[PDB]
Design a protein around this nucleic acid. Structure first.
Ligand SMILES: [Mg+2]
Ligand SMILES: [Mg+2]
Ligand SMILES: [Mg+2]
Ligand SMILES: [Mg+2]
Ligand SMILES: [Mg+2]
Ligand SMILES: [Mg+2]
Ligand SMILES: [Mg+2]
Ligand SMILES: [Mg+2]
Ligand SMILES: [Mg+2]
Ligand SMILES: [Mg+2]
Ligand SMILES: [Mg+2]
Ligand SMILES: [Mg+2]
Ligand SMILES: [Mg+2]
Ligand SMILES: [Mg+2]
Ligand SMILES: [Mg+2]
Ligand SMILES: [Mg+2]
Ligand SMILES: [Mg+2]
Ligand SMILES: [Mg+2]
Ligand SMILES: [Mg+2]
Ligand SMILES: [Mg+2]
Ligand SMILES: [Mg+2]
Ligand SMILES: [Mg+2]
Ligand SMILES: [Mg+2]
Ligand SMILES: [Mg+2]
Ligand SMILES: [Mg+2]
Ligand SMILES: [Mg+2]
Ligand SMILES: [Mg+2]
Ligand SMILES: [Mg+2]
Ligand SMILES: [Mg+2]
Ligand SMILES: [Mg+2]
Ligand SMILES: [Mg+2]
Ligand SMILES: [Mg+2]
Ligand SMILES: [Mg+2]
Ligand SMILES: [Mg+2]
Ligand SMILES: [Mg+2]
Ligand SMILES: [Mg+2]
Ligand SMILES: [Mg+2]
Ligand SMILES: [Mg+2]
Ligand SMILES: [Mg+2]
Ligand SMILES: [Mg+2]
Ligand SMILES: [Mg+2]
Ligand SMILES: [Mg+2]
Ligand SMILES: [Mg+2]
Ligand SMILES: [Mg+2]
Ligand SMILES: [Mg+2]
Ligand SMILES: [Mg+2]
Ligand SMILES: [Mg+2]
Ligand SMILES: [Mg+2]
Ligand SMILES: [Mg+2]
Ligand SMILES: [Mg+2]
Ligand SMILES: [Mg+2]
Ligand SMILES: [Mg+2]
Ligand SMILES: [Mg+2]
Ligand SMILES: [Mg+2]
Ligand SMILES: [Mg+2]
Ligand SMILES: [Mg+2]
Ligand SMILES: [Mg+2]
Ligand SMILES: [Mg+2]
Ligand SMILES: [Mg+2]
Ligand SMILES: [Mg+2]
Ligand SMILES: [Mg+2]
Ligand SMILES: [Mg+2]
Ligand SMILES: [Mg+2]
Ligand SMILES: [Mg+2]
Ligand SMILES: [Mg+2]
Ligand SMILES: [Mg+2]
Ligand SMILES: [Mg+2]
Ligand SMILES: [Mg+2]
Ligand SMILES: [Mg+2]
Ligand SMILES: [Mg+2]
Ligand SMILES: [Mg+2]
Ligand SMILES: [Mg+2]
Ligand SMILES: [Mg+2]
Ligand SMILES: [Mg+2]
Ligand SMILES: [Mg+2]
Ligand SMILES: [Mg+2]
Ligand SMILES: [Mg+2]
Ligand SMILES: [Mg+2]
Ligand SMILES: [Mg+2]
Ligand SMILES: [Mg+2]
Ligand SMILES: [Mg+2]
Ligand SMILES: [Mg+2]
Ligand SMILES: [Mg+2]
Ligand SMILES: [Mg+2]
Ligand SMILES: [Mg+2]
Ligand SMILES: [Mg+2]
Ligand SMILES: [Mg+2]
Ligand SMILES: [Mg+2]
Ligand SMILES: [Mg+2]
Ligand SMILES: [Mg+2]
Ligand SMILES: [Mg+2]
Ligand SMILES: [Mg+2]
Ligand SMILES: [Mg+2]
Ligand SMILES: [Mg+2]
Ligand SMILES: [Mg+2]
Ligand SMILES: [Mg+2]
Ligand SMILES: [Mg+2]
Ligand SMILES: [Mg+2]
Ligand SMILES: [Mg+2]
Ligand SMILES: [Mg+2]
Ligand SMILES: [Mg+2]
Ligand SMILES: [Mg+2]
Ligand SMILES: [Mg+2]
Ligand SMILES: [Mg+2]
Ligand SMILES: [Mg+2]
Ligand SMILES: [Mg+2]
Ligand SMILES: [Mg+2]
Ligand SMILES: [Mg+2]
Ligand SMILES: [Mg+2]
Ligand SMILES: [Mg+2]
Ligand SMILES: [Mg+2]
Ligand SMILES: [Mg+2]
Ligand SMILES: [Mg+2]
Ligand SMILES: [Mg+2]
Ligand SMILES: [Mg+2]
Ligand SMILES: [Mg+2]
Ligand SMILES: [Mg+2]
Ligand SMILES: [Mg+2]
Ligand SMILES: [Mg+2]
Ligand SMILES: [Mg+2]
Ligand SMILES: [Mg+2]
Ligand SMILES: [Mg+2]
Ligand SMILES: [Mg+2]
Ligand SMILES: [Mg+2]
Ligand SMILES: [Mg+2]
Ligand SMILES: [Mg+2]
Ligand SMILES: [Mg+2]
Ligand SMILES: [Mg+2]
Ligand SMILES: [Mg+2]
Ligand SMILES: [Mg+2]
Ligand SMILES: [Mg+2]
Ligand SMILES: [Mg+2]
Ligand SMILES: [Mg+2]
Ligand SMILES: [Mg+2]
Ligand SMILES: [Mg+2]
Ligand SMILES: [Mg+2]
Ligand SMILES: [Mg+2]
Ligand SMILES: [Mg+2]
Ligand SMILES: [Mg+2]
Ligand SMILES: [Mg+2]
Ligand SMILES: [Mg+2]
Ligand SMILES: [Mg+2]
Ligand SMILES: [Mg+2]
Ligand SMILES: [Mg+2]
Ligand SMILES: [Mg+2]
Ligand SMILES: [Mg+2]
Ligand SMILES: [Mg+2]
Ligand SMILES: [Mg+2]
Ligand SMILES: [Mg+2]
Ligand SMILES: [Mg+2]
Ligand SMILES: [Mg+2]
Ligand SMILES: [Mg+2]
Ligand SMILES: [Mg+2]
Ligand SMILES: [Mg+2]
Ligand SMILES: [Mg+2]
Ligand SMILES: [Mg+2]
Ligand SMILES: [Mg+2]
Ligand SMILES: [Mg+2]
Ligand SMILES: [Mg+2]
Ligand SMILES: [Mg+2]
Ligand SMILES: [Mg+2]
Ligand SMILES: [Mg+2]
Ligand SMILES: [Mg+2]
Ligand SMILES: [Mg+2]
Ligand SMILES: [Mg+2]
Ligand SMILES: [Mg+2]
Ligand SMILES: [Mg+2]
Ligand SMILES: [Mg+2]
Ligand SMILES: [Mg+2]
Ligand SMILES: [Mg+2]
Ligand SMILES: [Mg+2]
Ligand SMILES: [Mg+2]
Ligand SMILES: [Mg+2]
Ligand SMILES: [Mg+2]
Ligand SMILES: [Mg+2]
Ligand SMILES: [Mg+2]
Ligand SMILES: [Mg+2]
Ligand SMILES: [Mg+2]
Ligand SMILES: [Mg+2]
Ligand SMILES: [Mg+2]
Ligand SMILES: [Mg+2]
Ligand SMILES: [Mg+2]
Ligand SMILES: [Mg+2]
Ligand SMILES: [Mg+2]
Ligand SMILES: [Mg+2]
Ligand SMILES: [Mg+2]
Ligand SMILES: [Mg+2]
Ligand SMILES: [Mg+2]
Ligand SMILES: [Mg+2]
Ligand SMILES: [Mg+2]
Ligand SMILES: [Mg+2]
Ligand SMILES: [Mg+2]
Ligand SMILES: [Mg+2]
Ligand SMILES: [Mg+2]
Ligand SMILES: [Mg+2]
Ligand SMILES: [Mg+2]
Ligand SMILES: [Mg+2]
Ligand SMILES: [Mg+2]
Ligand SMILES: [Mg+2]
Lengths: 272, 47
RNA sequence: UCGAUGUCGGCUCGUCGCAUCCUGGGGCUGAAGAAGGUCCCAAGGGUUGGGCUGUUCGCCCAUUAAAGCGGCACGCGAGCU
RNA sequence: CGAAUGCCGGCAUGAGUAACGAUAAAGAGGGUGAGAAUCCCUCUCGCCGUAAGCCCAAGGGUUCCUACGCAAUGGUCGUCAGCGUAGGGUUAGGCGGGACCUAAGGUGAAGCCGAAAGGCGUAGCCGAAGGGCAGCCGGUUAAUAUUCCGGCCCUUCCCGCAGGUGCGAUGGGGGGACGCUCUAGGCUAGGGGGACCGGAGCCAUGGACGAGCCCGGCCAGAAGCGCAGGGUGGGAGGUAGGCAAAUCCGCCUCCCAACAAGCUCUGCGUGGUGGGGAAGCCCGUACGGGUGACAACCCCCCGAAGCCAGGGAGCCAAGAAAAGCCUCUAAGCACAACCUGCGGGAACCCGUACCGCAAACCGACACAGGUGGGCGGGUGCAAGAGCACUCAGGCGCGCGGGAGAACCCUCGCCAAGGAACUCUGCAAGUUGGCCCCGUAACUUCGGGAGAAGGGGUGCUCCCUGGGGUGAUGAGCCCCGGGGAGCCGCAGUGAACAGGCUCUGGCGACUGUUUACCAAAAACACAGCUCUCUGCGAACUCGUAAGAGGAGGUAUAGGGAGCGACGCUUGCCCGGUGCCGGAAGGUCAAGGGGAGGGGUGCAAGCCCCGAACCGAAGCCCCGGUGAACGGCGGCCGUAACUAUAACGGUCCUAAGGUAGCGAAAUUCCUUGUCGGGUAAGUUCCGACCUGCACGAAAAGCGUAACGACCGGAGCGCUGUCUCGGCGAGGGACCCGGUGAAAUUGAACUGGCCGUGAAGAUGCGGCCUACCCGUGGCAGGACGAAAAGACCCCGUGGAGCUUUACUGCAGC
RNA sequence: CGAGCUAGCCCUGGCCAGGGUGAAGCUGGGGUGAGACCCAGUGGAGGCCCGAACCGGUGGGGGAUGCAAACCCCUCGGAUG
RNA sequence: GUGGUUCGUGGAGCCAUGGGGGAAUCUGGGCGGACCACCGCCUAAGGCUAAGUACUCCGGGUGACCGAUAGCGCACCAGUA
RNA sequence: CGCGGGGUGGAGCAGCCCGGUAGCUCGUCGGGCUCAUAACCCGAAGGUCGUCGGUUCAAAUCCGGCCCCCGCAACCA
RNA sequence: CCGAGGGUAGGGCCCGUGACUGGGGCGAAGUCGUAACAAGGUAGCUGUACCGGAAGGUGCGGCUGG
RNA sequence: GUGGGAGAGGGUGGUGGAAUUCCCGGAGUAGCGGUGAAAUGCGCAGAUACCGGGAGGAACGCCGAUGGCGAAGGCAGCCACCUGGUCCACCCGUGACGCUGAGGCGCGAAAGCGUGGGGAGCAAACCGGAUUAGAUACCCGGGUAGUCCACGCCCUAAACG
C-alpha cells in the first residue's frame, strides 16, 4: 500500500500514489459504462454554483448497483476488481449466474473467486447483502439504504463502514461512519463488511498539478480579496479577520450550525 | 496585436441575424423599431 | 499665479556678492627667528581625488597654497537624470 | 453679437518646415511614349530560403485574365497598378458541405413553474475542424481543373437474370470505441553517392581530351502474385440475464485449435497499359515554345515524427457518442423478401476565380503590429526546425540626386589606469559549443554541479577496433583508437553558444497577476487546523419549477485560516461571537374576560378592557482560543560600586512562555562593540535600553529553487580619469510631394526702477542699419490638460460598521 | 444591446527540432537461517536540466503629431505541463 | 393584510380583496363618514348597449408659419453615405 | 502647545466626585514566645494632603495660577 | 623528455587569535530559600518527560542502597 | 533417538465477568463531595443514595505463594491455533563434533517520536480551592498529552544478585 518516491524532483519527494495490486483489470466493462457530463461547477444557467471546479482528466462513468434486491437469491462470482475514477472506492465486476453482470462497490477483503449473494436468506459474509433485520448485531456493514427500496446511500466511501448497535421495533440502531447514531428501517439492504481501499486517506497529492487532475482548481482565501468580494477583504497589509469569521456570502463559518431544526428526519437521529 | 473584430460569418448570423432577433421579445422590438425607422437593413447582411 | 509658476538631490553649463578659504599688500602682538594670533586692504585667478548615505549637510581616508560662505524661482528637468 | 476652450463653414499661421513608414542596394543598355530614376526587356549587383518559397482553412468578395485609359486613389513619378470603362473567366455520382450520425450546447410533443413577456424539461429533433463515405497519374486555357480531356479504377439507387437463405426492425446483441509517455519489426515519402546508363555542348588564363567539366537518370497503375502487419478461436450441450422474442449475446459445462494455423483486412512491391522526361543552343514571346530524344529510366547508401494501426510495453490522473456495419429474432410475408454475382439504366443542390503571415483578412492607411493546419531541398558546424551560405521559387521593401558640419540613432576600435563612474558595474564588456581532467561548505543524499579551475580543438601521411548494409566478403554509411609530421597571432579560425565566488533578507518549490507605468516579499501551491453537512445533506443560483453539489455519501462535500519540511505554538472565557441549558425573568398576535362605556322603551347592537395562559429573541446559567480578541504599574533589596535572583503594595479576565530581537519591525539613531575598507549612515556578527517582535493575520530554522531586494570580492571593461577616430541611417544642399499643436493683434532690445508684489509693451537711461540661414534652450510667468494636491458645494460615487431606517434570507 | 476583445468553464481537434540527467522496476551476481540491503546491467520516470518552434514580457536603449491609441532592437523567463 | 378616494390611521366610513370565519331571499339585504335609535335612499354577488369623447399613419383646406445654417433628420435617390 | 488622568503618614493605595468627620496593607517603635533570629501574638506611634492664591461658617474635597508625574495626539506638507 | 622551483586554482589537518557567549574551577565571614543526611517532617535514589527564581516539583516505570 | 512431564515462555485470533464512567428510563428530596478542619466543585434547571436498559475502554479479583516461566528486558480472566526454551526415565545411535568470544547481528521496562485508530479510569503540563512569610509543592476540585491498539523509530536504566 501507498507507493512513495525518491525525491528526484521536489514535489516528487513528499508525493504518494496508491497501490493498485488489488486492481485486477485495466479496462472497464463496455456494457456497464456510460459517459459523464462534466459540470464545471456550473448549473442549468451558465452560473457557477460551486467555486473552483473544472479541468481534470475526463472520466467514464461506471454504472454501479446499489439496489441488491433485484437479484434476490441469485448468486454471482466475483469476476474482477477495477479502478473507478469516480470514487474513493474500488468497484467489483461480478457475473451473476443469471448471466447478468453488474458493478458493485468492493468491500475490504473480497477475493476474486467469491460467490456472493443478496437476500433475507444468505450467509453473513463479505459481499453479501441482506435486509438489516437479518444482519446479526455488532456486524460491520456498508453501503446502506436509508429507507427501503431507495438505494444504498450511507458508508459508500473508501474505508467507510457502520455498526449495527441494536434493534428497536420496526427499526435498527446504527453508528454511522461519522459516529452519528441513527435509526434505520428493518428492511433496508446493507451489504456486510467495511469498504476498504482503506489506505485511501494517506495519499499525498504532493504537488499543485495533481490537484488539478482531480478537477479542483485553485482556492483563493477571503483574506486575500477586496471588500466588494468578501467579508475578509481589505485592510492594507494582511490584517486579521476583524469580525466573526465568515463565508463569502456572509454567514459565520466557525461553529454556526446549519442543519434545519424542524426536519422530520430528526426523530430518527440520536447523535453527533 | 489581436483586435476587437474577429469576423466570423457564422457567429454573426447566429448572434445578430434575423431568426435570432425573432425568438427574444427583446429582439422582436429591435425589428419593430428598425422597421419603423425605415432601415434598409434590419439585420447585418452576410457572405 | 489652482482654464497648472513641475518639488529634494545629482550632472552639465556657469555668472555674480564679499561679510576673504588661499595667493599679493598692510597695522598691532603677550611678534627673538621660523611659525602663529587678530584686525585692515584686496573679488584678479584659484579653491583636489576618494569611503558612507538619495541625501544637501555632515563624518572619515589621502593630499593641498587653500580644500571659503552666499545670491541667481533653495540658478539651471521646452538641458539630462 | 465680438467674446460663451460657443455652433456649422470658409480661409490663414506654423512652412516650402517636419515627414515621405524598416540601412535587403543598386548600375547600365535597349524598347515603347507628348512626357520615364520610377513601365517592358537584357545584363551586371544585393536580399529571403523552417522564407521574404509552395499548398490548405478562415475572412475578404471581381481584387482574377484581356483590351482601351491616367482625372482622382499610389506618400514622388507613372506610359504602370490591387485605379476608371469595357469584355471574358469558376464546369465534380468519387474534393468540401447537404438529401448520413451524434458532441457540448440549443431546441423541445409528455410534463412542471412563473403577474404578462417567460423559465425549466424525459423523449425525439437540431448541432462538427469529430464518427461514416466511392479518384489516382497527366494533358489542355489569357484565365478553371482530382471539376474539362486522356489512360486506368470505384460507389450508391432503380429494374432484370442466375444462383443462395425463413426473410424481415426505429427493437435485442456485437462493433464503432478511443488516455499519456516510451517503443519493436517491416515499408514509403524524402534525401546523398555512383567509375554505370542517357545528353546539347566546353578545354579559357598556367595546367588539363580526362575514369574531366556541366545536365539528367522517374510517375501513376485494377485483378493476380509476393513481402511486413492489423483483426478473429471452432463444436455442441444447458440457459432463469440482455424489460416481447432470438438460433444471437451473456453465463456454466464438455471436446477439439493454440497458433493468425485457417478465414479475413490494410499497407508496401511488382505489375497489362498510360505518362513524364534536364543542361544548352535556337526561336522573338509581354511569356511560353522548337529540338535535345527513339532520351536514359539502373545499382548503392541514409531514412521518418509518415504507413501497416485497433501494433507493443509501462503508468495513473483511468482516457465521447450515434449512425454506417454484422448478427438476432417480432409483427408481417413467405408465387414475398433478403444475400451473392452479372447486366443494363439512374445519380440532385451549394461551393470552386483571385488574396490568403498579407498592398485583397483584423488594426481609419498599399500601417515595421496581429492571424490556425501542411510542405519547407543542399553543404558545414555533435545534434536540430539552431546558425552561415544556398536551390527551386521570391524579393531590393512606390521619392530621388548629392554633400561628407554641429548634434542624434545603431555600430566598430582605442595608449596607461580598471568601477576611480554611479542611487546601483546601469550599460557594455568578459564568459561561451563539444571532448577530457577535475570540483567545496552544506544537504531533504536527489542534489549543491556547467560548482569552481583547468587541458584539447585545424591540417597531412602511416598503422588500426567495432557496428548497420551486404553472403560471412567489396562498396557504401556510422563510432572510434594509436604514431609521425605541416602551417598561422590565432584551428567551436566566420556564424549560433553561461561571466564566477562569498554572504544576508523574503518566499519552501514549477506556477499566477495590475491587457497598456508594479511580476513582486503579493496570489496560488501540496500540506496542517478549525468548523459546518445523515443525504430531498450543508452550501450556491433561481420568485418558482429546476439545476449545481453528485448520478458523490463523512477516507465525502461546503466554509475559514495557516502555507514544503524540521522543532514548536505558552497564559486569560470578564466583554464579543458561536455551542449547550425543559427551569426563572421579560415578550407579539392570539386566548382570557374582571370590570367600564355609547346607545335603545326594551330584548339588543356596538366599543373599551385588568388578572391569568401565551414563541422565537433578549436576560440569566455554563462551555468555548488553529473563535473576535487580550497578555500590568509604582517602591525597595546583595559586605566597593553597579545590577537585582528576593521583597512590598495597587490593579486585572489574565499579566508575553519558548524562540527571536536597532529587525522588510528601533523613535532617540550613523545606539554600542566586533568584521570587511586607506576611509563603511549601507552590509555581516554581537549586546538587549524590543518608542512600537512573538507563536496558524503563526514563532524560529531550513537544503534546493528566484529575470525578487541587500552587502563584498575575482575577472573584464569608454561606466569613469577624458576624451579621440572611424562606419553607416538622419540632420545640411538640390529636384518632387508636403503636415502639426499653437496662434487678441504686433512695428515683439538691455539695465535699474515702477507697477496686482518676477515688464519687449509704463519711467529714466543704455544699446541698436534692413532680411535671413544653421545652431542652443535662459525668457515670453513658453505648449498641452477648465490643478489630480489643498478648500468650498448642505455635488457625486466605491468601501465599513455595535450610524439611522428598511429589504432578502433565516 | 454586448463574451467575434477579454476572464472562466464545457465539447471536439491540433502542436512541442534537438540534445542532457538516468527514479522505480527487471535481471544477474554478493549477502543471509530467511531477509534487509550491496553492486552491476538493463530500463526510461520527472509541474527535472540546456535550447528552437510556440507562450511570455526581466532589464536597458529607441520611439513619443510614432511603423505603432503599447511598436522596435538588444537582453531575459517557461518550453511534457 | 392592502389598494382606490381629497383622506398619509386619523373619529376612517364608502368601493375593491390576499387570508380566517362564514348568512338569509321582503319582516330579506346594502347605504347616508366610527357606533346606536329614529327618518330616508337603494336593491350587490351574470351580461349587452349607439351618440356626445381621444388620436392623426393617410387626404384636403388655411396661415401677421420657415424659406436651404431656416423648415421634418431628408426641398437633392436619407433613416442613405 | 493641545486634550485626558494624577500628586495623601516611610513604601504602595483608598478617601476627593456628594465641603465638616483622613482610612487599608507593609514598614516603624515597645512588650511577648525562642538558646537566639524569622515567622507568629499583644500594644503603640506617625499626616496637612505638590504648592500659591480665592469660595465658604468650614476646604485633601468646589474654583483658578504656577510646578510636576502618567497617558494620547502632533495629519494633508 | 625530465626537471629545482615559480605562478594560477581548489581541498585537508594543525597552531594562534576574536566583539560576544556557554558552562566549569577557586576565593575567612554577601542575598534567597531548605532539596539531601534522623518516616529530614511528602522515605530516598533512579532512566525519562513536562514545568518552576533556585535548590528542585510532578507523571510513568524501576531499585532498596527503608 | 524413544518415551515422558511442569510451566503468567513467545506470536495470532476469539471470549467472560466484576467494577468505573457517561446516557435513557423509573421512583424519590436537600443536600452531595471533600478534609486535619475546610473551601473550590456538584445540587430544586432534581444532584447523592436506589432500581431497570444501553454504550465504551482499560485492567484481570479469590486461586496467588517468601510459587512457576524466560538469556535479559520481562510474562497472570478464559478458549483455540502456531511456537521457543527446558527437565526426567531407558543407555539405543554419532565419535571431541568442545569452551569462550574482539568486531557483527539481533532482543531490550518505562518514558519519549512519526502516521493512522482508540480514549473509560488515571493523569505530567495547565487552571482553581486550600496551607505558608511565600507554595510555581506536599492535601483537595477540575484537567490535556500520555497510558491502550497497529505499523515504524528511540537503545537508555539502582537494565541489581
Ligand atoms: Mg441559458
Ligand atoms: Mg482543495
Ligand atoms: Mg488559498
Ligand atoms: Mg488585495
Ligand atoms: Mg464584481
Ligand atoms: Mg461586505
Ligand atoms: Mg478585514
Ligand atoms: Mg487596494
Ligand atoms: Mg498591519
Ligand atoms: Mg490585505
Ligand atoms: Mg457533525
Ligand atoms: Mg473598429
Ligand atoms: Mg465557419
Ligand atoms: Mg430599398
Ligand atoms: Mg497653482
Ligand atoms: Mg494660462
Ligand atoms: Mg503652461
Ligand atoms: Mg572687504
Ligand atoms: Mg594674504
Ligand atoms: Mg602677507
Ligand atoms: Mg616672523
Ligand atoms: Mg578674488
Ligand atoms: Mg570667487
Ligand atoms: Mg566599494
Ligand atoms: Mg552608495
Ligand atoms: Mg545628515
Ligand atoms: Mg571633497
Ligand atoms: Mg531649484
Ligand atoms: Mg524631464
Ligand atoms: Mg519653461
Ligand atoms: Mg525640398
Ligand atoms: Mg522653422
Ligand atoms: Mg531644418
Ligand atoms: Mg528633411
Ligand atoms: Mg520612340
Ligand atoms: Mg533550408
Ligand atoms: Mg471563402
Ligand atoms: Mg475589405
Ligand atoms: Mg472594381
Ligand atoms: Mg492583373
Ligand atoms: Mg500621384
Ligand atoms: Mg481594373
Ligand atoms: Mg468524375
Ligand atoms: Mg432524395
Ligand atoms: Mg444533418
Ligand atoms: Mg440527428
Ligand atoms: Mg406544454
Ligand atoms: Mg428552453
Ligand atoms: Mg437536453
Ligand atoms: Mg462532419
Ligand atoms: Mg469529417
Ligand atoms: Mg467525399
Ligand atoms: Mg491560377
Ligand atoms: Mg490534375
Ligand atoms: Mg476524367
Ligand atoms: Mg417462426
Ligand atoms: Mg435471420
Ligand atoms: Mg438491418
Ligand atoms: Mg517514389
Ligand atoms: Mg543522383
Ligand atoms: Mg557518359
Ligand atoms: Mg546524340
Ligand atoms: Mg592554357
Ligand atoms: Mg569525351
Ligand atoms: Mg468456446
Ligand atoms: Mg443451445
Ligand atoms: Mg426473454
Ligand atoms: Mg496489387
Ligand atoms: Mg496498442
Ligand atoms: Mg438516431
Ligand atoms: Mg405470423
Ligand atoms: Mg478551381
Ligand atoms: Mg484556385
Ligand atoms: Mg509578420
Ligand atoms: Mg502559415
Ligand atoms: Mg506574397
Ligand atoms: Mg500580395
Ligand atoms: Mg509601401
Ligand atoms: Mg503589414
Ligand atoms: Mg504564429
Ligand atoms: Mg536544412
Ligand atoms: Mg547535416
Ligand atoms: Mg552544431
Ligand atoms: Mg534561420
Ligand atoms: Mg533566383
Ligand atoms: Mg524606405
Ligand atoms: Mg518607402
Ligand atoms: Mg583603454
Ligand atoms: Mg591596454
Ligand atoms: Mg584588473
Ligand atoms: Mg564610488
Ligand atoms: Mg563620486
Ligand atoms: Mg549588467
Ligand atoms: Mg552575453
Ligand atoms: Mg551530483
Ligand atoms: Mg555528490
Ligand atoms: Mg568549465
Ligand atoms: Mg594539433
Ligand atoms: Mg590549414
Ligand atoms: Mg596549437
Ligand atoms: Mg557578431
Ligand atoms: Mg558565441
Ligand atoms: Mg550556455
Ligand atoms: Mg536586514
Ligand atoms: Mg516564489
Ligand atoms: Mg497577485
Ligand atoms: Mg502592467
Ligand atoms: Mg491598469
Ligand atoms: Mg512590467
Ligand atoms: Mg518572475
Ligand atoms: Mg432564494
Ligand atoms: Mg441535484
Ligand atoms: Mg449527477
Ligand atoms: Mg472539511
Ligand atoms: Mg499568508
Ligand atoms: Mg495561541
Ligand atoms: Mg505564561
Ligand atoms: Mg475572553
Ligand atoms: Mg463564560
Ligand atoms: Mg464568553
Ligand atoms: Mg442559546
Ligand atoms: Mg420559561
Ligand atoms: Mg391581547
Ligand atoms: Mg380579545
Ligand atoms: Mg422564550
Ligand atoms: Mg458566563
Ligand atoms: Mg525570554
Ligand atoms: Mg541569541
Ligand atoms: Mg536590539
Ligand atoms: Mg547596526
Ligand atoms: Mg518595533
Ligand atoms: Mg578595522
Ligand atoms: Mg570600521
Ligand atoms: Mg563599525
Ligand atoms: Mg538601502
Ligand atoms: Mg545585523
Ligand atoms: Mg508579526
Ligand atoms: Mg501581533
Ligand atoms: Mg493570532
Ligand atoms: Mg509566514
Ligand atoms: Mg526569520
Ligand atoms: Mg534560507
Ligand atoms: Mg518562478
Ligand atoms: Mg523572481
Ligand atoms: Mg564614450
Ligand atoms: Mg563621433
Ligand atoms: Mg556619418
Ligand atoms: Mg522688473
Ligand atoms: Mg506704447
Ligand atoms: Mg504713462
Ligand atoms: Mg522700456
Ligand atoms: Mg533661427
Ligand atoms: Mg528657451
Ligand atoms: Mg531642441
Ligand atoms: Mg478648476
Ligand atoms: Mg450629499
Ligand atoms: Mg440595520
Ligand atoms: Mg472566448
Ligand atoms: Mg536501477
Ligand atoms: Mg536480485
Ligand atoms: Mg522541464
Ligand atoms: Mg509546425
Ligand atoms: Mg497568441
Ligand atoms: Mg500575462
Ligand atoms: Mg520589454
Ligand atoms: Mg523604453
Ligand atoms: Mg524621449
Ligand atoms: Mg528552470
Ligand atoms: Mg529552458
Ligand atoms: Mg492537459
Ligand atoms: Mg392609500
Ligand atoms: Mg386607506
Ligand atoms: Mg375577502
Ligand atoms: Mg348613500
Ligand atoms: Mg349619518
Ligand atoms: Mg342610495
Ligand atoms: Mg396630413
Ligand atoms: Mg417667400
Ligand atoms: Mg446650403
Ligand atoms: Mg437642414
Ligand atoms: Mg443661399
Ligand atoms: Mg440636418
Ligand atoms: Mg423644389
Ligand atoms: Mg432620397
Ligand atoms: Mg519588634
Ligand atoms: Mg610545483
Ligand atoms: Mg525530596
Ligand atoms: Mg528537607
Ligand atoms: Mg522528604
Ligand atoms: Mg508541579
Ligand atoms: Mg522523576
Ligand atoms: Mg552407547
Ligand atoms: Mg563405535
Ligand atoms: Mg526499548
Ligand atoms: Mg511505552
Ligand atoms: Mg513533545
Ligand atoms: Mg503515539
Ligand atoms: Mg490532583
Ligand atoms: Mg481527576
Amino acid at each position: 500500500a501507498v507507493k512513495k518516491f525518491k525525491p528526484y524532483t521536489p514535489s516528487r519527494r513528499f508525493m504518494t500514489v496508491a497501490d493498485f495490486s488489488e486492481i485486477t483489470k485495466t479496462e472497464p466493462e463496455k456494457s456497464l459504462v456510460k459517459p459523464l457530463k462534466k459540470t464545471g461547477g456550473r448549473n442549468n444557467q451558465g452560473r457557477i454554483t460551486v467555486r473552483f471546479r473544472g479541468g481534470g482528466h475526463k472520466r467514464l462513468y461506471r454504472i454501479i448497483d446499489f439496489k441488491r434486491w433485484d437479484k434476490v437469491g441469485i448468486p454471482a462470482k466475483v469476476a474482477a476488481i477495477e479502478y473507478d475514477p469516480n470514487r474513493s472506492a474500488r468497484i467489483a465486476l461480478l457475473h451473476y449466474v443469471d448471466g447478468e453482470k453488474r458493478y458493485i462497490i468492493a468491500p475490504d477483503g473480497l477475493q476474486v473467486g467469491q460467490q456472493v449473494v443478496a437476500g433475507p436468506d444468505a450467509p453473513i459474509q463479505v459481499g453479501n447483502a441482506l435486509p438489516l433485520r437479518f444482519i446479526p448485531v455488532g456486524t460491520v456493514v456498508h453501503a446502506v439504504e436509508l429507507e427501503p427500496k431507495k438505494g444504498a446511500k450511507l458508508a459508500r466511501a473508501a474505508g467507510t463502514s457502520a455498526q449495527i448497535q441494536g434493534r428497536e421495533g420496526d427499526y435498527v440502531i446504527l453508528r454511522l461512519p461519522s459516529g452519528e447514531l441513527r435509526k434505520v428501517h428493518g428492511e433496508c439492504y446493507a451489504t456486510v463488511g467495511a469498504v476498504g481501499n482503506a489506505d485511501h486517506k494517506n495519499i499525498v497529492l504532493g504537488k499543485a498539478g495533481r490537484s488539478r487532475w482531480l478537477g479542483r482548481r485553485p482556492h483563493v482565501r477571503g483574506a486575500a480579496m477586496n471588500p466588494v468580494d468578501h467579508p475578509h477583504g481589505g485592510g492594507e497589509g494582511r490584517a486579521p479577520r476583524g469580525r466573526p469569521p465568515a463565508s463569502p456570502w456572509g454567514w459565520q463559518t466557525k461553529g454556526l450550525k446549519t442543519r434545519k431544526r424542524r426536519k422530520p428526519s430528526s426523530r430518527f437521529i440520536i447523535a453527533r | 496585436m489581436k483586435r476587437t473584430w474577429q469576423p466570423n460569418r457564422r457567429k454573426r448570423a447566429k448572434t445578430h441575424g434575423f431568426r435570432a432577433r425573432m425568438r427574444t421579445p427583446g429582439g422582436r422590438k429591435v425589428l419593430k423599431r428598425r422597421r419603423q425607422k425605415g432601415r434598409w437593413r434590419l439585420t447585418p447582411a452576410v457572405r
